[PDB]
Amino acid sequence: VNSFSGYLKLTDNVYIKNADIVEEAKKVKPTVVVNAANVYLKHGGGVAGALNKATNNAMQVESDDYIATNGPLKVGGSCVLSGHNLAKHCLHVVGPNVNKGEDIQLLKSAYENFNQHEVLLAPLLSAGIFGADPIHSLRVCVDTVRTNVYLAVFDKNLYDKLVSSFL
């Protein structure tokens, strides 16, 4: 039993809710919140900007030190950093950016990072400004993640649609 309230059960291990990931994190304080990161951990907009803004830019400050030490992440890769006021940890995961021409097949590699954590609050990867189709992102998620994932989809029209076409 966990505290994730009001989630629809899609599969044995995937759950979904129409909610702002920032609000889910503030409410649940999960062990892991996933950020839809880029390779530079520049948290400008979308999920990352919203998460970072909610930390009062502390996520960005921490991230800049990470990059200075380690260099950019790989597309498909991840790193674990602090969750600040939102969660214990933030798993920064880089999905491929379709607008940059990055290989959508790297989306599966990106989701594999979730399997290192028993429970996660997460967005759909490669959606939004990353260019990919969220219905496809949900499919890859279901077919790749085996741990317990709670998807927060901050778009009621999209939330309702994802359910209606899910195979």
Ligand SMILES: CC(C)(O)[C@H]1[C@H]2CC[C@H]2CN1c1ncnc2[nH]ccc12
């Ligand atoms: C709708 C969505 C697919 O879930 C994505 C992407 C479309 C643009 C990105 C932001 N967004 C979010 N998702 C969940 N919590 C969020 N909080 C702030 C933004 C946000």
